[PDB]
Each structure stands twice: as structure tokens, then as C-alpha cells.
Chains A and B, each alone.
Chain A
């Protein structure tokens, strides 16, 4: 499966 590099949940 493929996902977007940017997501609402981002961490440092």
C-alpha cells in the first residue's frame, strides 16, 4: 500500500 508523506499526525 502507499501513503502520503504529509499527514495530519506529524512528529518531530
Chain B
């Protein structure tokens, strides 16, 4: 098993798009950041002030675009 980012691992301290929020790219709470498996990207689901009451672990979460497909 290897780190999700092998290009900025040394610069993990710096912000990089490969391992950061897709839109803002900030890290307000990456632990609460969900990634879409079909698109493999992070979503503002956690960047928004209002947090989710519960986070699904067994059920993979898909971005609205996937469901709107």
C-alpha cells in the first residue's frame, strides 16, 4: 500500500491538487471530506458550513453528477 499522493509526498505540507479539495483545495476538515468513487474526486460536502448528521462508510457515496447521470 502506498500514499494517495506519490508526487507531493515530500511536499505534503504544501497544498497540492492531487490530494486536496477539488474546488477550494483547502483542508478545513479532510476527515469529513467524502470522495466520489466513480469520479475519484473530493466534494465540498464538508466545505459547506452545515455538516452532515451522519457519514456513510459501508455505502459508497457518489457525487450528484453521478446520480444525475
Contacts and interface: CB of A to CB of B under 8 A. Distances in A.
Contacts, number: 33
* Chain A facing B: main interface SS: loop
B30 A8 contact: yes
Interface residues on B, range: 10 to 19
Q: Is the interface on chain A under 10, 10 to 19, 20 to 34, or 35 or more residues?
A: under 10
A8 B13 CA distance: 9
A4 B27 contact: no
Interface string B11-36: 01000000100000001001101110
Interface of A: 1-9
Interface of B: 1, 3-5, 12, 19, 27, 30-31, 33-35, 37, 55-57, 59-61
